[PDB]
Amino acid sequence: VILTQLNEDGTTSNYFDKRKLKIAPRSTLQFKVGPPFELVRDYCPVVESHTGRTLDLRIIPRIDRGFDHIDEEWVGYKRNYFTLVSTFETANCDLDTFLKSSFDLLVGRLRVQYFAIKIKAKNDDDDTEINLVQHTAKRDKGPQFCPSVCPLVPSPLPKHQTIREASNVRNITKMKKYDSTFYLHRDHVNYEEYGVDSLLFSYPEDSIQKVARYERVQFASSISVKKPSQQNKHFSLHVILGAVVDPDGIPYDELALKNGSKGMFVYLQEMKTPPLIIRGRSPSNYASSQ
DNA sequence: TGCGACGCAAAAAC
DNA sequence: AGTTTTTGCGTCGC
Structure with a gap:
């Protein structure tokens, strides 16, 4: 009835079919690693502005709630939350150096203001986009919102246990313990170490996430989960790493910028899950x- | 059909 | 060690 897989950090993912077994909402059995992500493609190259060195980039995503591996399918529930987390890494550039440097897109050089992640849901058979919604912990007693673009700096992805433990923290002492895992506070660096043109100082806010955490996510309530044939539809979750540039022939989305003007989120890399069934x-x- | 709404219930969080 | 919080889902009624 419960099938168990050992996770990378020594926790377990316990897959069960909610058609057959009802488990409490806050049971740790609701936390489990979802489907592995695969590369869709790489898009615009990024280079360091004097050396010309190409920046190696890699999205590091994981699903930590909401999906079960049942009879060779990955299965989610329309009514229930999922969690999707991601970082990115730069294999050829250590963080401290990266933040002091500056980077251009090779399209013809557009200066990168900052790096960011967004997520999308799609119908995996025809590429149609499907809306996602998020809630706060207060759920119906708080606002609903669409996943947002998350500025990030490169970081290792926290272990599944860490995401679990940080999921519903309010206590200040505990928040302090996790702060360095999830945030870089630019206002706490020594400004004298940085040039005006440095990447760190073109991020939009002083509090910069190290990890994109999309928690309490659902597929839009309007989604049709079956085809007319009554076969299940196949969905896929996508994670896209982008460079945000000043707009003043390559894939990009428009972005509401900080200064008010219309930024461009230029695609750098995209990963997706295998096909997903939603009940x-x-x-x-x-x-x-x- | 199935969706918005209301809120029970059970373990986490403190 | 009691209270509050969070979230799967049972249910009503349109």
């Missing part, structure tokens, strides 16, 4: 029906 609100999707 809808039908009673037959729940053990309560049996």
Whole structure:
């Protein structure tokens, strides 16, 4: 009834079918590693502005809640939360050096203001985009919002246990313990070490995330989860790493910038999950029906 | 059909 | 060690 896989950090992922077994909402059995991500493609090259060295980039994503591996399918539930986390790494550039340097896109050089991640959901069979929604912990007693673009600096991805432990922290002492894992506070660096043109100082806010954490995410309530044939639709979750540039023939999205003007989120790399099945609100999707 | 809404219930968080 | 918080899902009614 429960199939267990050992995670990289020694925790377990426990896959179970909610058609057959109902587990408490806050049970640790609800936390588990989801489908592995695969490269879709690389897009615009990035180079360091004097050396000309190409920056090696890699998205490092993981799903930590919401998806079970059941009979060779990855299965989520429309009504339930998923968590998708991601960092990126620069294999050829240590963070401290990276933040002091400056980088251009090779398209013809556009200066990179900052790096950022966004997530998307798609129908994996036809590439149609599907809306995602997020809640706060307060859920219906708080606002709903769409996943946002997250400025980030390169970092290793925290272990599954760390994401679990940090999921519902409010206590200040505990927040302090995790702060260095999730944030870089630019206002605490020695400004004299940095040039005006440095990458660190073109990030939009002083508090810069090291990890993009999309928690309490759902597929939009309007999604149709079956095809007309009654076959399940296949969905995929996508993580895109971009460079944000000043807009003043390559893939990009427009972005509401800090100064008000219309930025460009230029695509650098994209990864996606294998096909996902989403179970809808039908009673037959729940053990309560049996 | 199935969706927005209301809120029970059970373990985490403190 | 009691209270509050968080989140899967049972249910009503349109």
